[PDB]
Amino acid sequence: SEFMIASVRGEVLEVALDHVVIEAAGVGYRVNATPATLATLRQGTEARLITAMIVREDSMTLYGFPDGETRDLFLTLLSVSGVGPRLAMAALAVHDAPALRQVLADGNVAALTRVPGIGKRGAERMVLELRDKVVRSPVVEALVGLGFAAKQAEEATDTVLAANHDATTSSALRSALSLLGK
Amino acid sequence: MGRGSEFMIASVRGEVLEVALDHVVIEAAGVGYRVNATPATLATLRQGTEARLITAMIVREDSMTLYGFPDGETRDLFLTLLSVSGVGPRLAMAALAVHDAPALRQVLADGNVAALTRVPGIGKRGAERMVLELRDKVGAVRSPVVEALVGLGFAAKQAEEATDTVLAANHDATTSSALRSALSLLGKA
Amino acid sequence: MGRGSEFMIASVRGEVLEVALDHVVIEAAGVGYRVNATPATLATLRQGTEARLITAMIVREDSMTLYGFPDGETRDLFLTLLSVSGVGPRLAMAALAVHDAPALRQVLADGNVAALTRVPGIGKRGAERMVLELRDKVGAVRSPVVEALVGLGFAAKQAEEATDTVLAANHDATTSSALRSALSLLGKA
Amino acid sequence: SEFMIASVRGEVLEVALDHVVIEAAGVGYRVNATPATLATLRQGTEARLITAMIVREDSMTLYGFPDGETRDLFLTLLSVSGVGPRLAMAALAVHDAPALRQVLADGNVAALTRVPGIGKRGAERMVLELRDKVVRSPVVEALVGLGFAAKQAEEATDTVLAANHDATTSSALRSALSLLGK
Amino acid sequence: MGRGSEFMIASVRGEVLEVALDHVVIEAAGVGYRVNATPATLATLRQGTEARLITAMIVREDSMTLYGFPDGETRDLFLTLLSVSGVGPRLAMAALAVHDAPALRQVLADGNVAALTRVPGIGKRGAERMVLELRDKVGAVRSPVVEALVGLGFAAKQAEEATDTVLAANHDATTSSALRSALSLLGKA
Amino acid sequence: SEFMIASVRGEVLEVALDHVVIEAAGVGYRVNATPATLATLRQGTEARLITAMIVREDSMTLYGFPDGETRDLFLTLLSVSGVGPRLAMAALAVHDAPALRQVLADGNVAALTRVPGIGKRGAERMVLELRDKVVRSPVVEALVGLGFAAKQAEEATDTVLAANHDATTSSALRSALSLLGK
Amino acid sequence: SEFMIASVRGEVLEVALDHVVIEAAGVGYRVNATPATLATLRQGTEARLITAMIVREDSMTLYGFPDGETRDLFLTLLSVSGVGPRLAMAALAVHDAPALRQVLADGNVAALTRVPGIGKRGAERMVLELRDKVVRSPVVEALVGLGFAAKQAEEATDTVLAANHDATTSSALRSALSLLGK
Amino acid sequence: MGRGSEFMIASVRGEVLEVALDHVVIEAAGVGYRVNATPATLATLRQGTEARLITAMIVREDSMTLYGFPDGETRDLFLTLLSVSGVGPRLAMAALAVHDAPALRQVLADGNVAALTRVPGIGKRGAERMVLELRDKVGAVRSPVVEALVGLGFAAKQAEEATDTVLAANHDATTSSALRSALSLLGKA
């Protein structure tokens, strides 16, 4: 969820079948990508991918995608116990984000099992863990994320919105926070 | 930096590509850096415009993260929070999202545990450990120099002496010169 | 890349600031990257001029290192060496400093253990493990596609079938299209 | 000895007493430096420091210096058991590279002990470990570094130099290597 | 043991030196072993008398702990709980302190999430992951043998065949003999 | 709090100043102990110490004491950030458990600071963290320890005790648990 | 090669299909064993197995065998990259030590591949690594093991044996060592 | 023990089950302990008889090992060797197999680098680091007490004073009593 490299943009130096090399500031970044994302990319031209940076004791890796929503879905898959980055990429290479989303949403285990490395029991854990996972609400969420409880988060938010109808998401949040700081 | 060491990425500047509620993406040299930030810092930021945030880089076996702030003082305060046992980066960000640096500073300074407990994840006993550990920690020529010496390992006593001698002999002395003169003497030459 | 995974820095390009005998410093965006390289690769490099090396990034708990080479094939060969148990980055660099990629390739291919043993740190039993592990490993439309599928986890049998079907239906097929068509079928849709 | 970031160049954004911030490509790099190196630096101007990058499980740090020789001396200090980066920086902040070099060379333990954190027994281990440590030879060394033994390294080198008097360090090394590949 | 591997200390027997509410100390060979146990298991234990508990040994970088139970089945159930992601030893002990093995078994078997949620630290979504992962997991001659084969790596298909052949030829067969005969055949001899 | 070796009993083979060797079943266990605990021990005779077993990646160590209460106080000291086993032993070697207890209880920082390695700010963190730390209640605690909340723990307990006055600590706990299993 | 628990002896409390529990001094040790070794064991009776102790960050495990030679072969299998304890046990459960030995010795890859988890390329690495691996010599070896080189080891040994014909393995080694200490 | 800390298994006693050339197996309480030992220590050992070795227990992430010796002094010397950077357990055993403790002691004491270099794995520069680090380290009532105090963290100055005062007042003083009296005073009571 929190990493450092959120995207890479610059000249495509190489399109392979499971990754691309994008040169930013003379540095050529290898970012792994599905064949679908890769097909939109042309060597010699400038591109931008939205990335998830993965840091392990013995590796550092970029996984890239067309948009933040797809990148966030990738991270979401990684939140399932037993689902690592390769598998998550595998899954998205077989089912594009929309299709992967609906499969999970509809609990389509047969679809899921079509992915190498996802057995039936694995498919089910995924569906179970992810089924539900695929102004006012965003704000409540931010508060919750900061540690606040749904109850109190909602109340500060409703009060803030009530007093100020022009409120944007950020202002609402800063007003709510200010009240919660009590 | 502050009571939380030395890191590599001290700031990121360039085009704001995205303002979310708990982070921004700032593009430097085609690289889009995610830096986590309070809603207060975030509000000054506009997508499509250039921005600069002063950052703390956090390195763990399984992650690397930037936390960003309007100024070095606020960034140093964040690092300072992390020096308390049981206070990690999320919580420290949490604390600063609820109380802006000035307010957080005074709370700690005044030992306002009630204020502190208003932060999700900070209980009363946690609040107190914080106040205790940080009360004196929140906040000239002669003093900065002594501190640099102390930081290098020198003892207050000897550090102050080298510094007073140096400043006595040279009244024009700047902080760096004073420090280099003091060091020279302490090297016993 | 090769039998040694996926990393982040695939190349570095910019001004050569220093050519030493076992590495060069290439400045990209004001950042001077040390990349280790064979004397052979180094000789093509001139300080003061712009260069580009294709790199393997190595990440360990206590280090981060770039190894650089003239082309992707040579870089992939390096990674391949690292896939042998007991062969680390220094040794692999050592091996390529003594035998250039082509020669190293043929040595392994021909199982030339005497050639191999000429490398400091490669004994006879080490040489043999290498030849054994790498003999078939050194080195189209249909085959690259099958391989990508296999890499994604698919079995040779099914991978070849999807691929032949795809190529049969579409003779204009490129490697990527073939792969996307094959994948689509394998998704069973 | 082998790390990734060998220098940082760009605009000085801040000079402190124990570090500087140098902005390269919009990225502000904190590099720790002695008060001596720091004094040559002016905020608002472009600078370049030669750096040692230090990577630990829980940190990544740049230590900067005016030249490669000084940076290499820093790394050399770290090769002594018990001498970490802070201490090494401490040592160089008290004795500039030349002076530190001579102290070690002359085994001046009293000088050495003037450094906070270096006791007499520590001073001695240092002197002992480092006393000796502060065309034809460079080449032999490269070969040795690659794993070759002094004996054979010297022989390939002498033979190469003998046959080609115009030989540069790199050519000699590539010729020697070629012979050694036998 | 169960879905939680292989360990070294499978039981401890000797004099009860102390019965507390969440552990007992049992002295074997002058060594006093602390073994953590449910209040239910603890109640059968009397200081000054000899006892034997069947244990799971837990080894972590910074700890070594014994958890003890009246029988192997209960101990195996504990290990099984630990196979669920997010369920550690304290929680598993917690769960068994609230629902005795039989009751815990049935709860999981019947997917009784309400029962499960009665356990501190088990939320509804946690309860469900448990039920899902463990529903089939709670609970002959031919079957134990097949399982041992499977455990050794053999596939159900081939494991069953070797086993049926073995049992057909030898009706007197015990579980071990069957397994050794089956193995012998599978070695293809 | 939970470790494996809770005591060692058998023949004293050696009494040193900072540890003893106690032989159980032909195995000679080194257990570190304060000079006070050590003085009660005689080589050639049988002894029993109550121990805390400490397991780290690169060591395994027994610390022994006359009784469980003293052993538990040792573990309690280790719960303070910055206080490791040596220091904790140091502290108890300077102030016996009772005295150490009261010092902490009375916030006697001067007393505390008399311990090598405990500065004033360290002394205070200790006092702060430990000041409060030195049938019905034990039961509530067990329940709380199992994860139950004070409120509900107390209620199950009071109800159990009310219905059964003969109740022992264990029975009360098993009855309470049974109700809480609902 | 060097571990702590070299055998366990005492009452068999349980014989399963993939392990036994042997109670020594009131402690019940689980030792994993092949079905062949297990068949010689009877619950209620005393037994002794020769064991390899395996220590990992997150586990400690005993693997037992009838004799030291079989236990040493197990450790030998573990010296192959890619062959862990389960697999090694698997291998010995399919081919008894003698048969496993000869298979490796004869490079019988087909035999080897009959083991679940051993593919052809795995089988070959094994054969390659292990083919050769299955008074005077033992002594030379001990010396070599201590770090001495074959040449010098043999010479000290021959000289020692020459002077003393009655020499046992240990005496020869102690005499040789004494000479080598020069 | 010595300059190598505190461990758990300080000795093993019981029946010798096997004498090999670089280790013995000693059975205590049905448990057969492998303890590694020099050929010199091994020679005093007879299979079938009871023996006792004084041991250093070595704990690493991936191993646990006993090294054994005739007496505590020799065991402490071994631990002392391990305090030298670059000297691990095998090498230390190696060193003691070539030079018995007394001889190893004197070699170090006399700085006999030639003797030292006779050990496989000890080069000249290694020999010297050893001599340097250990020269003073090889080897009363008042002194042992001061040392215990120092070990507890007290400074030589204050440690000696408490000790001299204690011994002055009580001439009958034993090492332990002296230490407990000294400690009592230092507690400032």
Swiss-Prot record, chains A, D, F, G:
One of its GO terms (biological process) is DNA recombination. Keywords: Cytoplasm, DNA damage, DNA recombination, DNA repair, DNA-binding. The keyword DNA-binding applies. GO terms for molecular function: ATP binding; four-way junction DNA binding; four-way junction helicase activity. Residues 4-66 are annotated as: Domain I. CDD domains: UBA_RuvA_C. Residues 135-182 are annotated as: Domain III. InterPro entries: DNA_helicase_Holl-junc_RuvA_I, Hlx-hairpin-Hlx_DNA-bd_motif, NA-bd_OB-fold, RuvA, RuvA_2-like, RuvA_C, RuvA_C_sf. GO terms for cellular component: cytoplasm; Holliday junction helicase complex; Holliday junction resolvase complex. It is found in: Cytoplasm. SMART domains: HhH1. Its main location: cytoplasm. The keyword rRNA-binding does not apply. Has three domains with a flexible linker between the domains II and III and assumes an 'L' shape. Domain III is highly mobile and contacts RuvB. Belongs to the RuvA family. Homotetramer. Forms an RuvA(8)-RuvB(12)-Holliday junction (HJ) complex. HJ DNA is sandwiched between 2 RuvA tetramers; dsDNA enters through RuvA and exits via RuvB. An RuvB hexamer assembles on each DNA strand where it exits the tetramer. Each RuvB hexamer is contacted by two RuvA subunits (via domain III) on 2 adjacent RuvB subunits; this complex drives branch migration. In the full resolvosome a probable DNA-RuvA(4)-RuvB(12)-RuvC(2) complex forms which resolves the HJ. The RuvA-RuvB-RuvC complex processes Holliday junction (HJ) DNA during genetic recombination and DNA repair, while the RuvA-RuvB complex plays an important role in the rescue of blocked DNA replication forks via replication fork reversal (RFR). RuvA specifically binds to HJ cruciform DNA, conferring on it an open structure. The RuvB hexamer acts as an ATP-dependent pump, pulling dsDNA into and through the RuvAB complex. HJ branch migration allows RuvC to scan DNA until it finds its consensus sequence, where it cleaves and resolves the cruciform DNA. This is Holliday junction branch migration complex subunit RuvA. It comes from Mycobacterium tuberculosis (strain CDC 1551 / Oshkosh).
